[PDB]
Design an enzyme around this catalytic site. Sequence first.
Site, PDB file in Angstrom:
ATOM      1  N   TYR A 120       9.290  -0.777   8.137  1.00  0.00           N
ATOM      2  CA  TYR A 120      10.147   0.405   8.244  1.00  0.00           C
ATOM      3  C   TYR A 120      11.481   0.007   8.863  1.00  0.00           C
ATOM      4  O   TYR A 120      11.634  -1.158   9.261  1.00  0.00           O
ATOM      5  CB  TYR A 120       9.452   1.433   9.129  1.00  0.00           C
ATOM      6  N   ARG A 162       9.413   8.035  10.357  1.00  0.00           N
ATOM      7  CA  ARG A 162       8.136   8.299   9.659  1.00  0.00           C
ATOM      8  C   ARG A 162       7.090   7.232   9.911  1.00  0.00           C
ATOM      9  O   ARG A 162       5.940   7.410   9.516  1.00  0.00           O
ATOM     10  CB  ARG A 162       8.374   8.413   8.160  1.00  0.00           C
ATOM     11  N   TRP A 173      18.508  14.375   6.517  1.00  0.00           N
ATOM     12  CA  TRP A 173      18.575  13.084   7.225  1.00  0.00           C
ATOM     13  C   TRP A 173      19.580  12.131   6.573  1.00  0.00           C
ATOM     14  O   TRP A 173      20.226  11.357   7.289  1.00  0.00           O
ATOM     15  CB  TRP A 173      17.195  12.427   7.264  1.00  0.00           C
TER      16      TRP A 173
HETATM   17  C1  LIG Z   1      18.690   4.216   3.362  1.00  0.00           C
HETATM   18  C2  LIG Z   1      19.322   5.285   4.237  1.00  0.00           C
HETATM   19  C3  LIG Z   1      20.343   4.661   5.182  1.00  0.00           C
HETATM   20  O1  LIG Z   1      20.051   6.163   3.360  1.00  0.00           O
HETATM   21  C4  LIG Z   1      18.258   6.127   4.991  1.00  0.00           C
HETATM   22  C5  LIG Z   1      17.812   5.505   6.318  1.00  0.00           C
HETATM   23  C6  LIG Z   1      16.696   6.307   6.983  1.00  0.00           C
HETATM   24  C7  LIG Z   1      17.110   7.751   7.208  1.00  0.00           C
HETATM   25  N1  LIG Z   1      16.014   8.520   7.796  1.00  0.00           N
HETATM   26  C8  LIG Z   1      16.099   9.060   9.020  1.00  0.00           C
HETATM   27  O2  LIG Z   1      17.097   8.915   9.721  1.00  0.00           O
HETATM   28  C9  LIG Z   1      14.909   9.810   9.536  1.00  0.00           C
HETATM   29  C10 LIG Z   1      14.566   9.638  10.876  1.00  0.00           C
HETATM   30  N2  LIG Z   1      13.566  10.224  11.501  1.00  0.00           N
HETATM   31  C11 LIG Z   1      12.786  11.070  10.764  1.00  0.00           C
HETATM   32  N3  LIG Z   1      11.749  11.647  11.432  1.00  0.00           N
HETATM   33  C12 LIG Z   1      10.961  12.479  10.770  1.00  0.00           C
HETATM   34  C13 LIG Z   1       9.854  13.061  11.617  1.00  0.00           C
HETATM   35  C14 LIG Z   1       8.674  12.215  12.007  1.00  0.00           C
HETATM   36  C15 LIG Z   1       8.497  13.320  11.035  1.00  0.00           C
HETATM   37  C16 LIG Z   1      11.130  12.790   9.424  1.00  0.00           C
HETATM   38  C17 LIG Z   1      12.158  12.212   8.734  1.00  0.00           C
HETATM   39  C18 LIG Z   1      13.027  11.316   9.397  1.00  0.00           C
HETATM   40  C19 LIG Z   1      14.125  10.664   8.793  1.00  0.00           C
HETATM   41  C20 LIG Z   1      17.575   8.386   5.911  1.00  0.00           C
HETATM   42  C21 LIG Z   1      18.688   7.570   5.257  1.00  0.00           C
HETATM   43  N1  LIG Z   2       7.070  11.448   2.619  1.00  0.00           N
HETATM   44  C1  LIG Z   2       7.395  10.017   2.659  1.00  0.00           C
HETATM   45  C2  LIG Z   2       8.913   9.895   2.742  1.00  0.00           C
HETATM   46  C3  LIG Z   2       9.413   8.465   2.645  1.00  0.00           C
HETATM   47  C4  LIG Z   2      10.925   8.433   2.757  1.00  0.00           C
HETATM   48  O1  LIG Z   2      11.619   9.303   2.237  1.00  0.00           O
HETATM   49  N2  LIG Z   2      11.427   7.412   3.454  1.00  0.00           N
HETATM   50  C5  LIG Z   2      12.846   7.169   3.636  1.00  0.00           C
HETATM   51  C6  LIG Z   2      13.110   6.661   5.043  1.00  0.00           C
HETATM   52  S1  LIG Z   2      12.709   7.870   6.328  1.00  0.00           S
HETATM   53  C7  LIG Z   2      13.358   6.145   2.665  1.00  0.00           C
HETATM   54  O2  LIG Z   2      12.670   5.162   2.430  1.00  0.00           O
HETATM   55  N3  LIG Z   2      14.553   6.355   2.113  1.00  0.00           N
HETATM   56  C8  LIG Z   2      15.112   5.402   1.174  1.00  0.00           C
HETATM   57  C9  LIG Z   2      16.139   5.987   0.225  1.00  0.00           C
HETATM   58  O3  LIG Z   2      16.219   7.233   0.131  1.00  0.00           O
HETATM   59  O4  LIG Z   2      16.839   5.172  -0.419  1.00  0.00           O
HETATM   60  C10 LIG Z   2       6.647   9.356   3.809  1.00  0.00           C
HETATM   61  O5  LIG Z   2       6.226  10.071   4.748  1.00  0.00           O
HETATM   62  O6  LIG Z   2       6.433   8.131   3.740  1.00  0.00           O
END
Ligand SMILES: CC(C)(O)[C@H]1CC[C@H](NC(=O)c2cnc3nc(C4CC4)ccc3c2)CC1
Ligand SMILES: N[C@@H](CCC(=O)N[C@@H](CS)C(=O)NCC(=O)O)C(=O)O
Lengths: 199, 198
Positions: free
Chosen positions: B7, B13, B103
């Site tokens: 991750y 997550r 997010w």
């Molecule tokens: C690839 C990228 C840069 O575009 C991504 C990087 C990761 C980002 N995700 C978050 O910041 C994030 C952070 N905490 C969370 N916590 C939850 C709570 C626990 C259930 C749910 C969703 C969350 C999403 C989205 C954009």
């Molecule tokens: N419901 C899925 C959501 C997974 C997900 O959306 N992960 C995000 C990071 S929090 C991701 O990999 N994003 C990559 C992208 O959108 O390019 C889980 O709980 O694993």
Amino acid sequence: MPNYKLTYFNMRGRAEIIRYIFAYLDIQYEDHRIEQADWPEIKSTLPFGKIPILEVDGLTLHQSLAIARYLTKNTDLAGNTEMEQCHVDAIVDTLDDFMSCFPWAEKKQDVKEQMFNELLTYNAPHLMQDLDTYLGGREWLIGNSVTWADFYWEICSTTLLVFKPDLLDNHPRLVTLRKKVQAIPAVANWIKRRPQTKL
Amino acid sequence: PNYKLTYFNMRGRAEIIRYIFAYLDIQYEDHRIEQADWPEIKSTLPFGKIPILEVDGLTLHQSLAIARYLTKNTDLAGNTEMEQCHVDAIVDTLDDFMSCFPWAEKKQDVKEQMFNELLTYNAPHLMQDLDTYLGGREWLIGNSVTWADFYWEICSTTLLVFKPDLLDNHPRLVTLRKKVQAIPAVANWIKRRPQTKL
Ligand SMILES: CC(C)(O)[C@H]1CC[C@H](NC(=O)c2cnc3nc(C4CC4)ccc3c2)CC1
Ligand SMILES: N[C@@H](CCC(=O)N[C@@H](CS)C(=O)NCC(=O)O)C(=O)O
Ligand SMILES: CC(C)(O)[C@H]1CC[C@H](NC(=O)c2cnc3nc(C4CC4)ccc3c2)CC1
Ligand SMILES: N[C@@H](CCC(=O)N[C@@H](CS)C(=O)NCC(=O)O)C(=O)O
């Protein structure tokens, strides 16, 4: 025999996976459908103000995928190994994640329309391609027999086709999988006998 | 088996999986990537998302599917099929809520507006619902801790970064957080994990 009562709106929606599971397992249940007029009344009584719910021998359950998992526990539909059960859950969650992106309850037509379009145009084909790659040349999504992920795929894809009829044009193997699910007699019988709603 | 969790360097997550490994005393590689690593890795994943868990070289995805797989036949699962249903429902209720937050949104104006919208109107209703559902009990389901309690503590931690007053009128939900945090295995992981915003 246990007493089952399913409460949802009059449509397929998030209740439909439960209805497929009931049909497939040949379980008798009250398919209690409600008009929106009655929605604020019942809502006040619900634990987290959401449907569908399932009453089981006077005990209330909520969350449609939580309910579907409960009903398929100890059945062939859950998967043939612990790892395969994870894959079933993960494919279901992947599909549900994508369906949940759509703004179903959006009051503003123009915002709802733009969003439905963006998802269907860019996101949806990425998912179809990943799903097609995941299935490969196998008969079912997980293992060597039907699971409730195959049911969910069929239900989700049915609703996507209403808005984007060309979604599976370049994915005949995913169309085959829909046909195989629909051909399961207990599922066929439910599809033929169910209220015809848009969603 | 050998476990490798992949991750971003954040709770997010993956944190539910990390709590379960700590609790069950399971050694695992906690593999954390920077955004810069992400495009390279994304193409190798069947659904292009993280977290993923590798179990003796076999890849699992979807954080809650993995949580359910790891907790099966353990004291974290829920003692009966019905209680397992309750565990799943609570986690899904919490996860639905956390999923509403944009997010990945670029424009910080529309992002802050929606965050405040969700934290202002929607978050207090969910807090009131959870407080009711908890009633006389010390844990969300049954008479002992489940991974739903873990998930509550994880989701509430992230919400309290944005709205620190969210549990002012809900001391039993505060108590629940503190009970999860007093579990030695969890306390130990919380002390040692990388400190991140999310
Ligand atoms: C690839 C990228 C840069 O575009 C991504 C990087 C990761 C980002 N995700 C978050 O910041 C994030 C952070 N905490 C969370 N916590 C939850 C709570 C626990 C259930 C749910 C969703 C969350 C999403 C989205 C954009
Ligand atoms: N419901 C899925 C959501 C997974 C997900 O959306 N992960 C995000 C990071 S929090 C991701 O990999 N994003 C990559 C992208 O959108 O390019 C889980 O709980 O694993
Ligand atoms: C009362 C009201 C007007 O506020 C409600 C009424 C019900 C509406 N729900 C839907 O339109 C709807 C329909 N199908 C769905 N299918 C899925 C996936 C396929 C399983 C997920 C979510 C869905 C939501 C939202 C507004
Ligand atoms: N993840 C939940 C979602 C439940 C849900 O939001 N259902 C909608 C109907 S599709 C609802 O009850 N909406 C009522 C409202 O939010 O006012 C599930 O699958 O059961």
